[PDB]
A paper describes a structure:
[name] is an uncharacterized effector secreted by [name], the causative agent of human Legionnaires’ disease. We found the uncharacterized [name]-encoded [name] protein to reproducibly break viral restriction in LD652 cells. We then used limited proteolysis to produce a core [name] central domain (T55-R287) that was amenable to structural determination by crystallography. Overall, Ceg10TR is composed of 8 α-helices surrounding 7 β-sheets in a conformation resembling a cysteine proteinase with a putative catalytic triad consisting of Cys-159, His-196, and Asp-204.
We determined the structure of the trypsin limited-proteolysis protected core (Ceg10TR) from three different data sets to 1.7 Å, 1.4 Å and 1.5 Å resolution, respectively. All crystals used for data sets in this study were grown from the same batch of purified protein, but the crystallization condition for data set 1 was 2.0 M sodium, potassium phosphate whereas for data sets 2 and 3 the major precipitants were polyethylene glycols. Interestingly, the conserved catalytic cysteine, Cys-159 (C159), is nitrosylated in two of our three structural data sets, indicating that this cysteine is highly reactive and particularly susceptible to oxidation by agents such as nitric oxide. In the S-nitrosothiol structure, the carboxylate of Asp-110 is hydrogen bonded to both the nitrosyl oxygen of C159 and the sidechain of Trp-206. In the S-nitrosylated structure, Asp110 also hydrogen bonds to the nitrosylated-C159 and van der Waals interactions occur between the aromatic ring of Trp206 and the nitrosylation moiety. Analysis of the electrostatic potential mapped to the surface of [name] and RavJ reveals that the catalytic site of RavJ is buried while the S-nitrosothiol of Cys-159 in [name] is solvent exposed. These data together indicate that [name] harbors a highly reactive catalytic cysteine that may be critical for regulating host responses to infection. To date, of the >215,000 structures available on the Protein Data Bank, only 43 deposits display an S-nitrosothiol group, highlighting the unique nature of this modification. Furthermore, to our knowledge, [name] is the first structurally characterized S-nitrosylated Legionella effector.
Author numbering: 57 to 247, 254 to 284
């Protein structure tokens, strides 16, 4: 029985994977870019500790467990007493702890993981940008790589020309719309783009209370 809740067909997933392979086979990375690329591949693997229910390869019976994470995420996103960064990180933590979540939750998880890693001295992580094709969330790292933990795919982006790879791989997925970002100066932005000074003020507490001392969000090979 195919997964009746699949949001993409097997054919659609295969076509995206083939385009990602085309991009990756054509890129050559320098030594520092290769280090970040390896971190990105590792982070996408760690995101597979979270199961979705909306891929054609997923188990339809996991929909009721994903739903518990989705209820929490919806309640959290609607709260008026939390910053946007806190909401995103709370959902990342709930999704990783439960083991269930779809593309939004898995993108939030990798955002949280890489934000934690960015606190280390001379981390190669400098900017993080969550963005969406309609409801399909992805993460752009350093304006140089795109990560899709839902599909366990990633690829580099041409400098000064990132729409080349994005427009090829995600042709027919629609316009990419920003959701939340942190730049190299530590400034936070929501989506037109609006600065989010409350998340900036809250950044240290978000990192401490939701990310620190959780084996989930810590990497050691680096
Ligand atoms: Cl790092
Ligand atoms: Mg870089």
């Amino acid at each position: 029985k195919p997964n009746q809740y699949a949001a993409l067909t097997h054919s659609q997933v295969q076509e995206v994977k083939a385009k990602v392979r085309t991009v990756n086979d054509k890129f050559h990375l320098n030594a520092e870019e290769k280090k970040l690329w390896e971190l990105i591949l590792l982070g996408n693997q760690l995101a597979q500790n979270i199961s979705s229910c909306d891929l054609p390869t997923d188990n339809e019976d996991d929909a009721s467990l994903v739903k518990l994470t989705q209820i929490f995420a919806d309640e959290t996103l609607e709260r008026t007493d939390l910053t946007w960064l806190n909401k995103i990180l709370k959902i990342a933590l709930y999704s990783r702890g439960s083991g269930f979540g779809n593309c939004q939750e898995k993108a939030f998880f990798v955002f949280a993981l890489l934000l934690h890693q960015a606190q280390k001295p001379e981390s190669l992580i400098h900017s993080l940008r969550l963005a969406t094709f309609n409801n399909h969330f992805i993460l752009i790292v350093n304006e140089q790589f795109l990560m899709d933990p839902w599909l366990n795919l990633a690829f580099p982006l041409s400098k000064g020309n990132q729409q080349l790879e994005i427009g090829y791989v995600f042709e027919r997925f629609g316009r990419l719309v920003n959701y939340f970002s942190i730049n190299q100066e530590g400034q936070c932005f929501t989506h037109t783009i609006e600065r989010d000074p409350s998340s900036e003020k809250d950044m240290a507490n978000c990192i401490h209370s939701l990310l620190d001392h959780r084996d989930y969000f810590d990497l050691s090979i680096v």
